[PDB]
Amino acid sequence: TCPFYKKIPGTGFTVDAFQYGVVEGCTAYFLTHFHSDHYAGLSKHFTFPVYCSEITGNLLKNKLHVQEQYIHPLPLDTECIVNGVKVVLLDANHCPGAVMILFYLPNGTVILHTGDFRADPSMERSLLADQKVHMLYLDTTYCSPEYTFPSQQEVIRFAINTAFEAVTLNPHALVVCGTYSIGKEKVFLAIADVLGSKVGMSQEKYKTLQCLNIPEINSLITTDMCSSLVHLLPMMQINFKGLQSHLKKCGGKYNQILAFRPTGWTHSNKFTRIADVIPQTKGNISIYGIPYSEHSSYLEMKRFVQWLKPQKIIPTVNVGTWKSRSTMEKYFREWKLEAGY
Template identity: 60%
Template sequence: MGRTRNWNGGATFSYPRGGSQGAPAAKQCPFYKKIPGTTFVVDAFRYGTIPGCTAYFLSHFHYDHYQGLSKHFRHAIYSSKVTCNLVKKKIRVADRYLHPLPLNTPCDVEGVQVTLLEANHCPGAVMFLFQLPDGKNLLHTGDFRADTSMECYPALTGCKVHTLYLDTTYCNPAYSFPAQMEVIDFAVGVAVEAVQHNPKTLIVCGSYTIGKERVFFAIAEALGCKVCATRDKKNTLDCLDSDQVKRLVTLNGRETRLHVLPMKDLKFNSLKSYLEGYRPQYDSVLAFEPTGWTHNNSVSTVANIRPKRHGNITVYGIPYSEHSSYTEMKRFVQFLQPAKILPTVNNGSPKSRHAMEQIFQQWDSEGKQQSLASWVK
């Protein structure tokens, strides 16, 4: 066993060293993936069978959260219906191990009340509210994009959260980007204008295995057209049990001007070759690459978005993030006023943890001052 350290409220975790023969020790599940007072873990499949764990919770179907999960998994998995559909379809985990839970409905899991809340991340992504028999409430956000609508969630109304397991992907004031709907409206406006200017424009939208669907569905609704997807993408979208998917998604590229491609295929040469397959129906490409915040795409307002052009190919990198911006995260935390925060991202170094602790303390202090000012008024 390696060193142990106490951090953020005295939780203990370890850094394993190699075994006695020099072989690396098996990965140990870190404390921030375990729910105290239960035998539950969240997004901890990469650690194999965890001693003492009786229930494995999966917040959403992104690889960094289900990594390690295979068709040979033989333990109870709790998640949303959409995520369970995806796990069954893509990984082929047996039905008997999948336990889909409804949204916004308290469910008893081994004596713990568990409520799934929409996380505003990718389809099927949820936050888990664990309400323990001793009265403590623990909220695990999984990956999420905080939104003011979450402040109206009945389960969170008047709920005193003891521990918040927080998605801290962008927990730095430098991470500022537009609201999701602003970016969607921008993309829709650009697409509509392009088609009006040139009816032979082929619209392409990049996507991951799951995620960014709101962008291309909004464009489809605005243009009154269907969405052409690859067979693999359509199989994934079918897992959403969505009427919109059934109504709009097609495999026939000749049937619509809006196509969805993997992000890796949005390079100029790839798009040029793709266009050749649809001539003379189309003679130009307008592509959207929805990404989060990057140093090369650090725009705080849609007015600053600029396209890249190469002949008849135009590509817009749009700052459509499915993680909270710094200000959105701050507002959510100040709304909840948790007693304790455990960051679940970028928590691997003492320097990073200390920086986030300083930020959390600042938010807490500001929140208390605002509450006092409001009370005085």
């Protein structure tokens, strides 16, 4: 049964609620982004409207095979009328096609649903700057002060450096990057750009990327593995036995892999900076974990919420235990008392 934090009051609208069957009263099912926990349930057999971004739409049509009529894509940053309720989609700074949704209720209430987001100061000079927001449905993935991690631009620096070093030292080495969903495309796009290469990948991964409205994408990616010295592989596969396996397949064309596992937070964020990172090493295969996040750090979340001064906050992540819910409330209360709302 659909939880109350997936429903929007005073509408027939639900958000990321595709795994419960038909929801009684729901005229419209919104989808913030193409990540499987959020879309779990959709298929070709959906015959209710879906509102989402253009890019999420492309993924729906081509990867799930939903029928063009039931996909309502909306532009971003444009006031849009939807069953006689004004809504806006805003860029969520998460993965490609990910959005936050502003709902303007008939009664005068204004609700922001952040979907998954990495809060940023550019969101403070968006349309959000123009009016008061009463309710906030918030991505609380990292709502605890231990969760620090570097900027995306810092991490892309490290990466472009590591890879471009090794390749210039040994020009018969492979750069691999791990992946399992959309997100974090900048990791491999940046490395390939520095190496003068296209990124090579499976057919199913190429198919996914071809849905994302990336400019010049035909010049950046390929399904010809042999022609490419940045390869993408499944994240399950990024390990010694599975990389060995892969190093066989290339047929005596490379004598050393240099992988990257972009990850979220791990406990080695608590003691080690990004400039002082190391790989695990079993022979000629070297595996970096690098903490490229597409969610808000604690500080980023705190700043956004303290600027928004929402009258009420409804968490969407880690809501499954009483302990987590309780911890989160205490932080929300601190933030409110500090900031004077």
